[PDB]
Design a protein around this ligand. Structure first.
Ligand code: ATP
Ligand code: ATP
Ligand code: MG
Ligand code: MG
Ligand code: ZN
Lengths: 737, 121, 295, 207
């Protein structure tokens, strides 16, 4: 803005003396450790004097001073009201009373493994804090405090300080990282200023320091939101005989990710705000903290009208943004502020406004001009059935938006994406999105540049989005990649669609089970917001490091990943066994894998996988659905029984022999599939014939196989038998010549 | 008598209820009944279990009458088969055919006797 | 207003923009455009079109008939009347988000608040047809396949010219790939229950629910946006004509939807959505037959 | 005058059928080609488009070079003949009770079948599922009499008669050169519902 450079950086770079006092172990009070440190790094006393007095209790009367705002916004961004432990797990207070877990404090990278908590990190890993603090000092030196570089500083915290706790001498705030706590405190502290500079006050010591309990009751914050509607009608507009099948499917789910990104980053500079206020962004849904005044509400209503005119001019009611705001006082604090109906129940008030506006979509003057007619069109866009601006891209007649999506699918491999003015694939009013190389930023004229899966600072001063993406090969080669070095593998490619089970039920309510409700704060759900986006948007490429697959989309709860079938099955086993260690077993997910032949269309492929996901949601909730709706196993007996226990023992038999070939395996599948009471006897006869038919050296190997196979045939609980069928499908598929 | 939901568990119990060679401890707990005397009984029923599929029941009732001949006759020769038709209630079940679906239920009942006999020793 | 026209399909393809999709019901505009395409080839359209511009006659889209006429789900009419067990009541708002049909026996309990776990009408198949030995020859056709007792019942004016037309739609079929085995039905004109014809109003100024897609007249569209809770659904497609030798496009009438709750129920149109420089009209029937909620 | 006469026949399968469709999952032992079925009853169906395209390609070899196929099956161009006057319906397997009285396990037999390489001499087994012999399906065929028509109505009747003799000389299914066809139309009667058109003299053209 025009003065908020003094307020935003000072309310963000305060408590960074809590890093150096953490690093080298000084005995000085932490309010001064970042105060003096700023002097040998930069020189701006107005930002500095907030950090000199952000504690506001060692010397409350020294210097109308904006550190008054930094004090109250530190209390409210903290879930509590304010001795050397690490950052605790967020899932220590999620759900049930389980073991305590603590993060190992590290930085982030594009090649770093997921840093899981454990019970062995109660001590204080002091040595990494030297490596953290020198990473700060190398990039805070050559740096300028402006709206150009208002955004590179946030990733400097969200990568490095992402696991460092805050105020470790405590009993409650054990899991609020300093990257998140500085992000929320700078988010609130701007919103007090936009709440106070609109009312007309200039002094900050009588409505903040003395009327704090009045401000604890004063409704001074909106919780804005939006909801991008019609996403799956836009993404899954693929059909059989689509000329670009998978590239358009990977482009449109990325297109609406940038559009959901640009609805955020264009509403915040229409206001006087920035990316600290955005508490979350996901698949269309995103949550803000804005100022509670008429100068910002009328900006929201105007921008909702102005942005829907953009969507209507390019999509014709396929997409619709729906705002909603809930005014709230300081009631998202665990200090018994009407604990049942206060925290979610004003986060729900903005959610009811979205439902009121998703149901009363347009108004008079738009719908009078929607169906004005006067258009003798002849050919339609054969993808999205639109009419205007038809071009002839590779002898099909497509529209103007779907033309750029083929161009955006060619520009998708780049690392940088810019907001041009008139350069194709529009995502806003006077805003178009373009893929661009690194040094082409000198050439092209832009307004904001988005960089994808990156943590380097660079010269672009960009905005760091995180889109999950991987390709080990082209999509049409994944069938022929399913061989081994021998040649033994079935030429199939599998598609998995994962989904976290009850994600909004774990986001919104989530933490109220432990305690009396003293963990139902904003900062827990803001840390839960990051940790579910930090997993699926960043860590999923580590799980797909060398696997022969292609993550088409991973965002929010949902993963959609085509690939070779040995690795896709290995992917989700490796994903969940990481994801249950990431969350201590809570937030179980569900998956559905489907084998498909070579050269089948992706719309036939992506649909039936969706049939298996919605079938696996209805097992009870927590299941994998291999290949077909009738292999719906729990994950808690698919990895520990099918994929690693039963398939290991079948593979241990059929490699230490040359006698029992595939014909023995195939006649077992008929016996496992029909399963009347008569086939129990016929199986007991079939194994006992071959027990003496074999050569008498390896008769114990067959007898320790057959009496162990007959054991899980007659169990009469069905949970030990259908697994044996699925274990033998995964063995013949691995030995298919 | 034997229904569809029990005739294999009946035949599982009948092999266990059948006696064993308690003496002659050279691979002991072996049966007095032998495999080849048992497969002579199933060779009667297995050629009706596949002509029940093809033909009517109205033509098979001449050989279904003959199964009471030879299950008695094989029981009269060796005392081991004599115990089989007592333990496994075969002469009771053979007089209760009356249609195709019990003929196939009895002929699957004889296969259940051969299956568990091969299984248990 | 008058007798409901029960129609038993057992195979039907209903639109929704694409060919890979098939909606359960078909709405007022389609069945009316079937009648005009029927009354033309009887040489009898001008007796129907002179009737088609009267206050006397009504018309209603399809709803499932499972031993009793059903109704749409009111759009947002149930109120938020319970901050307990958020883990599962959000899952309850998942199954009660694709329901869209309520029985008349208990539609008053829905406004009063009741869960009503949805029953099944016509599980939609998607069979992949072809054309042999051609270039680009794999289309895919969805199919509503009805559940052994479910019929559809347009609710219209009991008119003898209307019954002569809709006894011939038994043999021309509604919906999609008719002349390929879809949409052929058998009509059975029944009578209305007494507590349903009690509330088949058209001009009752109260908290009133629509039972068909209706584009209001422009004097009424201003005030109907205020308290209404509607869907919009984009009626469009190609105009069928025997007089073009060229497949043109309708002019994209954005209507309301059946189930749109409203106040001071408005009067609709017959919206000439003909393309530019086109011989005849494309009627695109849109006028409401409402449903009172509390009365 | 206006009329809609229909051709009610009982079709009959002297060999199997195989009308496939969506291919879900092979599952090793499971059927490599499941026949199309009625997804409520799980009885084998004959879809009407599988009749409608089959009897027009047969008549394309007879009446080709058009004009008499266009009015009986439609054409996307040619404004005279969109929705061309024949409205078929899917077959419904009438005798789901008469087959059970004959004694039958399920209505759809499974045929095992393979493929032998010319040099390796190694097999490659199918499981082509069929719908069994002498099942009867409900066959109905709405031909429409109109004001434009009754000049050529008699000459359409000498085509649909001939367009059902050819299905008795071709297969109407999938994999027809390997059997799986040989369908026969019996009790082929031409009733008139919703109309006034004398269907007497047509009924002797059918037999
Ligand atoms: N950008 C995206 N990419 C892929 N999947 C998405 C995306 N956004 C949403 N989804 C998936 O679609 C589902 C719902 O999307 P939808 O467009 O229906 O949201 P909505 O309109 O807000 O739904 P509702 O009206 O029920 O609140 C989510 O559960 C999510 O898994
Ligand atoms: N990244 C995210 N973080 C938190 N919540 C999310 C995210 N993405 C989507 N959601 C939530 O998901 C809800 C939609 O349900 P969704 O199917 O997406 O997950 P869910 O609530 O766990 O339900 P399900 O068990 O059916 O997946 C929305 O209310 C939205 O708040
Ligand atoms: Mg989810
Ligand atoms: Mg979801
Ligand atoms: Zn398009």
């Amino acid at each position: 803005k025009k003065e908020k450079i003094d307020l935003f950086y000072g309310a963000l770079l305060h408590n960074i003396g809590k890093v150096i006092q953490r690093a080298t172990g000084e005995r000085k009070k932490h309010a001064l450790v970042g105060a003096d440190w700023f002097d040998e790094i930069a020189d701006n006393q107005v930002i500095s004097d907030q950090i000199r007095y952000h504690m506001a209790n060692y010397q409350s009367d020294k210097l109308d001073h904006l550190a008054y705002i930094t004090y109250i916004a530190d209390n409210i961004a903290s879930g509590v009201d304010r001795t050397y432990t690490n950052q605790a797990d967020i899932f220590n207070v999620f759900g049930a009373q389980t073991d305590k877990r603590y993060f190992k404090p590290t930085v982030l990278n594009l090649k770093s493994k997921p840093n899981f908590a454990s019970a062995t990190y109660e001590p204080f890993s002091k040595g990494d804090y030297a490596a953290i603090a020198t990473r700060i000092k190398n990039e805070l030196a050559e740096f300028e405090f402006n709206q150009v570089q208002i955004d590179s500083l946030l990733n400097l915290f969200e990568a490095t300080l992402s696991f460092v706790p805050s105020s470790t001498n405590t009993k409650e705030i054990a899991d609020i990282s300093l990257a998140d706590h500085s992000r929320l405190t700078a988010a609130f502290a701007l919103a007090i200023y936009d709440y106070l500079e609109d009312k007309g006050r200039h002094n900050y010591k009588e409505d903040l320091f003395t009327k704090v309990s009045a401000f604890y009751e004063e409704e001074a914050f909106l919780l804005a939101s939006f909801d991008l509607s019609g996403i799956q009608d836009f993404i899954y507009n693929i059909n059989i005989a689509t000329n670009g099948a998978a590239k358009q499917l990977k482009a449109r789910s990325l297109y609406l990710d940038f559009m959901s990104e640009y609805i955020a980053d264009s509403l915040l500079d229409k206001l006087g705000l920035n990316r600290a206020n955005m508490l979350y962004v996901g698949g269309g849904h995103a949550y803000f903290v804005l100022a509670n005044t008429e100068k910002t509400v009328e900006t929201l209503v105007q921008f909702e009208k102005d942005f829907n005119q953009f969507l209507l001019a390019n999509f014709q009611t396929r997409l619709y943004v729906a705002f909603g705001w809930g005014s709230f006082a300081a009631k998202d604090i665990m200090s018994e502020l009407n604990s049942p109906e206060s925290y979610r129940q004003v986060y729900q008030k903005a959610s009811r406004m979205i439902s009121k506006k998703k149901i009363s979509r347009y108004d008079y003057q738009t719908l009078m001009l929607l169906n004005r007619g006067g258009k003798s069109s002849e050919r339609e866009c054969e993808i999205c059935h639109s009419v205007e601006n038809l071009v002839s891209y590779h002898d099909q007649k497509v529209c103007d938006i779907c033309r750029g999506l083929y161009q955006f699918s060619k520009e998708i491999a780049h690392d940088h994406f810019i907001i041009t003015e008139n350069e194709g694939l529009p995502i806003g009013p006077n805003a178009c999105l373009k893929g661009v190389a690194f040094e082409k930023l000198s050439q092209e004229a832009f307004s904001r540049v988005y960089v994808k899966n990156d943590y380097k600072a660079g010269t672009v001063k960009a905005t760091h989005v995180f889109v999950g993406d991987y390709q080990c090969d082209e999509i049409y080669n994944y069938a022929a990649l399913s061989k081994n070095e021998n040649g033994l593998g079935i030429k199939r490619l599998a598609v998995v669609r994962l989904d976290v089970d009850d994600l909004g039920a774990a986001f919104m309510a989530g933490f109220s089970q432990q305690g009396n409700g003293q963990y139902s704060t904003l900062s827990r759900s803001a840390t839960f917001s990051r940790s579910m986006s930090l997993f699926f948007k960043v860590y999923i490429n580590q799980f797909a490091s060398d696997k022969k697959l292609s993550i088409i989309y991973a965002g929010g709860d949902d993963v959609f990943a085509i690939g070779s079938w040995q690795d896709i099955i290995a992917f989700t086993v490796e994903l969940r066994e990481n994801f249950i260690k990431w969350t201590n077993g809570k937030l179980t997910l569900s998956a559905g894998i489907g084998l498909f032949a070579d050269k089948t269309p992706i719309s036939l492929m992506a649909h039936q996988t969706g049939e298996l996901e919605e079938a696996a949601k209805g097992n009870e909730k927590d299941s994998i659905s291999l290949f077909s709706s009738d292999y719906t196993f729990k994950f808690d007996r698919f990895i520990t029984n099918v994929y690693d226990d039963k398939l290991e023992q079948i593979r241990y038999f059929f490699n230490h022999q040359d006698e029992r070939g595939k014909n023995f395996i195939y006649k077992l599948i008929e016996l496992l599939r029909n399963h009347d009471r008569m086939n129990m006897a016929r199986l007991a006869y079939y194994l006992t014939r071959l027990e003496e038919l074999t050569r008498e050296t390896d008769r114990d190997k067959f007898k320790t196989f057959k009496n162990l196979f007959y054991s899980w045939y007659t169990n009469k609980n069905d949970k030990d038998r259908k697994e044996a069928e699925l274990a033998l499908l995964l063995y013949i598929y691995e030995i298919r010549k | 008598i034997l229904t569809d939901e029990n005739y294999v568990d009946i035949a599982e119990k009948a092999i266990l209820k059948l006696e064993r060679n308690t003496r002659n401890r050279k691979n002991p707990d072996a049966f007095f009944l032998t495999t080849s005397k048992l497969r002579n009984l199933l060779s009667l029923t297995s050629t009706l279990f596949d002509e029940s599929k093809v033909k009517e029941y109205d033509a098979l009732l001449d050989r279904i009458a003959y199964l009471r001949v030879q299950f008695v006759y094989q029981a009269g020769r060796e005392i081991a088969v004599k115990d089989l038709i007592e333990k496994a209630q075969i002469l009771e079940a053979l007089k209760e055919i009356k249609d195709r679906e019990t003929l196939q239920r009895f002929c699957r009942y004889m296969e259940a006797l051969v299956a568990y006999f091969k299984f248990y020793g | 207003t008058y007798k409901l026209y029960i129609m038993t399909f057992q195979n039907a393809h209903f639109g929704s923009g694409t060919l890979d999709s098939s909606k359960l019901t078909f709405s007022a505009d389609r069945i009316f455009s079937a009648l005009v395409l029927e009354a033309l080839k009887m040489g009898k359209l001008d007796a129907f079109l002179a009737e088609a511009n009267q206050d006397k006659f009504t018309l209603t889209d399809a709803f499932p008939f499972q031993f009793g006429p059903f109704l749409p789900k009111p759009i947002g009419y149930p109120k938020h009347d319970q901050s307990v067990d958020v883990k599962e009541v959000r899952r309850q708002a998942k199954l009660s988000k694709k329901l869209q049909f309520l029985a008349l026996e208990n539609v008053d309990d829905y406004l009063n608040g009741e869960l009503f776990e949805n029953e099944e009408h016509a599980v939609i198949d998607t069979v992949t047809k072809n054309q042999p030995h051609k270039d680009d020859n794999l289309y895919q056709v969805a199919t509503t396949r009805f559940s052994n007792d479910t019929s559809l019942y347009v609710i219209a004016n009991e008119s003898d010219l209307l019954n002569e037309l809709m006894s011939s739609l038994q043999y021309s079929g509604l919906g999609g790939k008719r002349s390929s085995g879809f949409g052929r039905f058998e009509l059975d004109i029944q009578n209305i229950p007494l507590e349903l014809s009690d509330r088949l109003t058209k001009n009752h100024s109260d908290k009133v629910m629509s039972l068909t897609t209706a584009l209001p007249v422009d004097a009424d569209l201003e005030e109907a946006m205020e308290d209404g809770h509607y869907l919009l659904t984009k009626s469009s497609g190609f105009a069928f004509s025997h007089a073009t030798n060229e497949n043109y496009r309708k002019q994209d009438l954005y209507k309301f939807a059946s189930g749109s709750t409203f106040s001071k129920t408005f009067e609709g149109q017959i919206v000439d959505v003909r393309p530019l420089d086109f011989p005849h009209a494309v009627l695109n029937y849109a006028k409401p037959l409402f449903f009172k909620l509390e009365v | 005058t206006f009329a809609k006469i229909k051709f009610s026949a009982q079709i009959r399968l002297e060999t199997g059928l195989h009308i496939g469709g969506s291919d879900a999952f092979a599952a090793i032992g499971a059927i490599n080609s499941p026949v199309i079925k009625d997804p409520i009853t799980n009885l084998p169906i004959i879809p009407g488009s599988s009749l409608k395209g089959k009897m027009r390609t047969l008549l394309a070899k007879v009446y080709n070079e058009s004009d008499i196929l266009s009015r009986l099956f439609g054409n996307s161009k040619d404004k005279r003949f969109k929705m061309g006057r024949l409205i078929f319906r899917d077959a419904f397997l009438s005798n789901a009770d008469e087959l059970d009285s004959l004694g039958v396990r399920s209505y759809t037999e499974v045929k095992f079948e393979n493929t032998i390489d010319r040099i390796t001499a190694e097999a490659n087994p199918r499981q082509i599922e069929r719908a069994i012999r002498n099942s009867t399906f409900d066959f109905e065929l709405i031909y429409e009499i109109t004001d434009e028509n009754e000049n050529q109505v008699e000459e359409d009747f000498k085509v649909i008669r001939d367009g059902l003799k050819l299905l008795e000389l071709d297969y109407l299914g999938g994999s027809g050169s390997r059997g799986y066809g040989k369908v026969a139309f019996e009790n082929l009667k031409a009733t008139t519902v919703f109309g006034n058109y004398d269907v007497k003299t047509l009924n002797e053209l059918l037999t």
